[PDB]
Amino acid sequence: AKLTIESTPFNVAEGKEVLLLVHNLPQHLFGYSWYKGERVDGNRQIIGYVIGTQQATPGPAYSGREIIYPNASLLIQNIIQNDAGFYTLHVIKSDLVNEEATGQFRVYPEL
Amino acid sequence: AKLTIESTPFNVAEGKEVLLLVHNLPQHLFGYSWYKGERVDGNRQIIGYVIGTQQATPGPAYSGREIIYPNASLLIQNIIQNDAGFYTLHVIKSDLVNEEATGQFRVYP
Ligand SMILES: [Cl-]
Ligand SMILES: [Cl-]
């Protein structure tokens, strides 16, 4: 019942893509804020996304390789080792009962 | 300059009040939340305000003593020793690229 992130695949080949799937999204949504690391921290913000206007805006940690989906799921393309680690989603609601979840993935080289 | 919190006064007498001033707010804002502590943590949200709405909303840490001004400043009445410590403002921009700043105050008997 709780907001959760699941990476697919959990172990990712360099040069390939990972999808951070988002489950149990709440109602009353204004939009989404994604971060590298285990907490909400503006210095590590990848991207912000407003549902009503469909506008995505890069944060300080934006790489240009990300795609955000309407249900908050986040894809990262052309993966490098440095991408490995934790990713945190903050869901901003009109009632400010904002929800947070964290997921992770690992990276491996190929050939 | 950078978003900064200024406690007024920094050293607060038990039973008196404190006002946390907010300097250098960015333009184009959705709203704000105040937290007890040094991070954004939903369990420690005191109060929040969505710009343009008729009311402020209490979080789990609300104690009936706090008001948040439209410019994000936090006023707390009837201070007790347990109020001492860090307070973190989460500024929610209209583009959802958000920012935080942390301030602090001390309480004396
Ligand atoms: Cl990490
Ligand atoms: Cl504290």
Side-chain angles (χ1 to χ4, degrees), chain A residues 36-38 44 83-87:
Chain A
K36 187 70 192 61
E38 293 178 82
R44 309 201 72 192
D83 293 331
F86 294 98
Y87 288 80

Side-chain angles (χ1 to χ4, degrees), chain B residues 29-102:
Chain B
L29 301 184
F30 172 80
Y32 333 105
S33 292
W34 281 99
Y35 296 88
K36 187 67 190 308
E38 279 189 81
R39 63 177 191 188
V40 169
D41 170 348
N43 298 313
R44 314 194 69 190
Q45 182 165 185
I46 304 172
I47 194 172
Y49 177 63
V50 175
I51 290 165
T53 67
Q54 304 157 127
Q55 65 283 302
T57 177
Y62 182 72
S63 69
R65 299 176 298 146
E66 307 91 349
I67 270 117
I68 183 176
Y69 284 88
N71 74 1
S73 46
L74 183 67
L75 175 73
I76 313 172
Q77 304 293 291
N78 299 125
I79 291 286
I80 55 165
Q81 191 68 38
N82 193 237
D83 294 328
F86 294 103
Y87 290 75
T88 297
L89 173 68
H90 179 226
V91 170
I92 303 157
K93 294 222 311 292
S94 294
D95 68 10
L96 292 177
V97 174
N98 307 330
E99 291 188 39
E100 306 77 52
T102 299

Side-chain angles (χ1 to χ4, degrees), chain A residues 12-58:
Chain A
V12 193
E14 273 193 314
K16 299 288 169 71
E17 74 203 352
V18 63
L19 182 59
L20 307 168
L21 273 175
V22 172
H23 302 292
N24 310 137
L25 204 56
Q27 299 291 134
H28 305 129
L29 252 33
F30 178 65
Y32 316 133
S33 300
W34 271 102
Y35 304 83
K36 187 70 192 61
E38 293 178 82
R39 70 175 201 281
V40 175
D41 177 356
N43 300 312
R44 309 201 72 192
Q45 191 173 345
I46 296 166
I47 198 166
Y49 176 84
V50 183
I51 291 160
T53 63
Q54 299 183 62
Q55 294 307 108
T57 305

